[PDB]
A paper describes a structure:
Mammalian lipocalin and secretoglobin allergens are associated with a function in chemical communication that involves abundant secretion into the environment, high stability and the ability to transport small volatile compounds. Lipocalins are a highly diverse protein family and on average, its members (allergens and non-allergens) share <30% amino acid sequence identity. They all feature highly conserved β-barrel structures that enable them to transport small volatile hydrophobic compounds. Guinea pig allergen Cav p 1 isoallergens are found in hair and are expressed in the harderian gland. Furthermore, we solved the crystal structure of the major guinea pig allergen Cav p 1, a lipocalin closely related to the well-known semiochemical hamster aphrodisin, allowing us to compare the binding cavities of mammalian respiratory allergens belonging to three different lipocalin subgroups.
Author numbering: 4 to 150
Write the structure that this text describes.
């Protein structure tokens, strides 16, 4: 499931991590899977201190279909959904200070969700404790490059 992808929306119980400036407000660029997807390489940008910080990271599949990646702390995410033009993740981020920020991340080829996909995502968030308000839609706020 390789290619050039875009972050459509992000969510977090601690919204600050995905707000403009937070380390988890991640605008994706590439999601390259290996042969059996036991490792996924992610090229992505994060606006931090007014800088578009590029990162290229590997997420390895544990023996339980979960994925561990080091990025702004220890992260453990599952692929909650996977369609032809979209896919969602539910990550548990443990930053340097031990704060556990759990949340969702929709990544796809388009820049926005349909009305049906939107309500479904809102339900999934409130269901997993995250409020409807703690959902940032990164559409139109991607002022980073591909260098």
């Amino acid at each position: 499931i390789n290619g050039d992808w875009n972050t459509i929306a992000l969510s977090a119980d601690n919204k600050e991590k995905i707000e403009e400036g937070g380390p988890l407000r991640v605008y994706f660029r590439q999601v390259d899977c290996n042969d059996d997807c036991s490792e996924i390489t992610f090229r992505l940008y994060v606006k931090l201190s007014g800088e578009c910080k590029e990162s290229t990271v590997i997420a390895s599949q544990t023996p339980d279909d979960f994925y561990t990646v080091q990025f702004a702390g220890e992260n453990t995410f599952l692929i909650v959904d996977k369609q032809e033009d979209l896919f969602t993740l539910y990550n548990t981020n443990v930053d340097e200070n031990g704060l556990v920020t759990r949340g969702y991340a929709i990544i796809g080829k388009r820049d926005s969700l349909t009305p049906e996909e939107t309500s479904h995502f809102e339900e999934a968030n409130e269901l997993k404790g995250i409020p409807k308000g703690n959902i940032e839609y990164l559409a139109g706020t991607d002022d980073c490059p591909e260098r």
